[PDB]
Symmetry: C3
Subunit: 231 residues, 3 copies
């Protein structure tokens, strides 16, 4: 799909929407488009970001074709880019609100877990499915999940590839708020406009303090990706 990310500034917020016409795979093209959209948000100096998926998914994860192939450097580059995007969003100086508009799997769940506030509908599944399909979870991904999940949810989400949704996702720490499907996006935008009213300097400084060790470990995980591939 020709333009997998849209960027729209609406007063105090920017809305960044993923729709590649498929499952919003976080391959190189999608990552480039997402980074370009956040660059726009930087230039526009917005009060808050909203990131959404499409009518089917938030994101189904990395480009599975690149993963299943066995190619080495392309996979390393895709994983590094995905986790760098996570680092960028977790450290973002403005509030970031995720509109989880469908299921969020693997890198989709990791991306979702970078929002300051995360809104989903009851039925939307959130899952690190890596272990179910033969992939060991990268250290950077573990650190992203560890930052948000309860101790017991973290255990099951990782080693057992547990699927969460609705009340179990809320209790686990995979999402912060449940809304009806037709208002997930509007509620995300409402929340973003509210958070834009927080003191930006204090928000930016405090969120970094509240994530310092995780960010350091994510950085280490990004640096270590090639070694995870035996290089």
């Amino acid at each position: 799909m020709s333009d997998p990310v849209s960027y729209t500034r609406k007063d105090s917020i920017a809305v960044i929407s993923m729709d590649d016409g498929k499952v919003n795979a976080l391959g190189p093209a999608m990552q480039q488009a997402l980074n370009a959209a956040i660059d726009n948000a930087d230039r526009d100096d917005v009060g808050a970001l909203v990131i959404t998926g499409n009518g089917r998914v938030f994101s189904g994860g990395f480009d599975l074709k690149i993963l299943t192939s066995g190619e080495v450097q392309p996979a390393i580059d895709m994983l590094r880019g995905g986790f760098e995007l996570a680092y960028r969003l977790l450290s973002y100086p403005k509030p970031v609100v995720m509109a989880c508009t469908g299921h969020a799997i693997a890198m989709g769940a990791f991306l979702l877990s970078c929002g300051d506030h995360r809104v989903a509908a009851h039925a939307y599944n959130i899952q690190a499915n890596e272990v179910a399909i033969g992939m060991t979870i990268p250290y950077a991904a573990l650190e992203i999940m560890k930052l948000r999940l309860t101790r017991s949810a973290y255990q099951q989400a990782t080693g057992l590839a547990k699927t969460f949704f609705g009340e179990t996702a809320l209790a686990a720490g995979f999402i912060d708020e449940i809304a009806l499907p037709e208002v997930v996006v509007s509620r995300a935008e409402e929340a973003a406009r509210e958070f834009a009213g927080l003191n930006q300097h204090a928000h930016a400084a405090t969120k970094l303090r509240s994530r310092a060790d995780a960010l350091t470990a994510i950085r280490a995980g990004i640096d270590g990706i090639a070694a995870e591939f035996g290089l």
Copy 2:
């Protein structure tokens, strides 16, 4: 008011009540009065402590006048003393039960978070409001919250200044028990009496083990308080 804390021994427990006639601001006078009451508990060798607020709040937090007066050293000194009190309570060798008798804001919430057991009523708001009013949360306060809040509640409580109460406070780890307003204090006292029946030596040793990293992090936060402002 000049006499903001009362101390009452009731057999196996001591009840320490904050009431400055207003919102129990945790300025130097209140901190000294709380410390004096805890000194009394030390001398009495009580089985457990109960700390309460007044009829309208647990505590609204630090003295707002001192906090925003522009005079840096008095503000630093007040924060230091507040976090020192938190350290003292988190490491206290007897069970400590908090009766959250109204809202608990900022340092009020941090103080609340030092209790082994914390009781509130459903409508009582518990909130680190720093970011909403333009303040970065001090490291010592972050570490206090980090010890009690779930991973996701910690994120929202801090960077988003989220308000918690009732079920969300329970789920988050900002409180351990919700009771009707009229029985918050008596529930806290009853719980304290039961905890006084635990083995004190094992309680004191176990709680320190269960808080070891938090305590060193809080101590670092206290030692680095001036550097936070310069």
Copy 3:
């Protein structure tokens, strides 16, 4: 009793049941019998393990006669080695909590990848109530599963959990009716045996790395601090 652990292979899984006829005390004999049953699972290369208690308890904990110095140290080290063996097990481990789980019984329960109990069953580290400081190895096992605030109360206040409160605390993962705790555990185990074994084993070690290091330290330190 004379034969306190049973081992049965069914489908892709092994079911290991503790029943010493009493409260499944985790003394040296029970630990040896459990280790031998896990050996069977190793030899059979099973897809997953289910560990159950008996009709009255999961386990009441250590043999108190021994705990109340060298025999005590040895029993504690052995119990925490058993915990370590299960926490690091290369196949999914499902616990069928068939009654209460107290002290070492709760620590053992907390080593399962998935833990199923009935609403009524109490789970508690009662050490502080009975005059014992909780060992570091036990603290680290609990710290891996309990929420921040449940961890505080479970330890220093010897809080008892059950059903929805155990679920919220992270002392269990699933509640089932008493009569289906074991069958649900087996169903979960069959499901988990379908996960990729290599990825499961590698990922669980990563998700538990710091805890395993700290539990090893806790085992090593059992004597130095008794």
